[PDB]
Amino acid sequence: GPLGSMDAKARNCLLQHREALEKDIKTSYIMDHMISDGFLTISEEEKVRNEPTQQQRAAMLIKMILKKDNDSYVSFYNALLHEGYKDLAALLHDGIPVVSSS
Numbered sequence: 001g002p003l004g005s006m007d008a009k010a011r012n013c014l015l016q017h018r019e020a021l022e023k024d025i026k027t028s029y030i031m032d033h034m035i036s037d038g039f040l041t042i043s044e045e046e047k048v049r050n051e052p053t054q055q056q057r058a059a060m061l062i063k064m065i066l067k068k069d070n071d072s073y074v075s076f077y078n079a080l081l082h083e084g085y086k087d088l089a090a091l092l093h094d095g096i097p098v099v100s101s102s
Helices: 008-015 028-037 042-050 054-065 070-082 086-093
Strands: none
Touching: 008 054, 008 070, 008 086, 028 042, 028 070, 042 054, 054 070, 070 086
């Protein structure tokens, strides 16, 4: 039984804000912070990096989040804060049940 999965309200606040999703959700340093965080494995890194441009690259980063978990989502969330994308992440903070905690 999967526990601590990605919350619907959380995952939605992220993807639903497609108003700025594809527009501000980057994959460069954001993924760097996620892999260094240890949430994105070499396989994860490979897929996103396999894609040629922000097209399927950023889409792949967001596409991973489509079926990851709360833990990874808060990591992807934290990565947004790592690259000055606090606004998008704030839009997702509604679903994130933590306030840094670091």
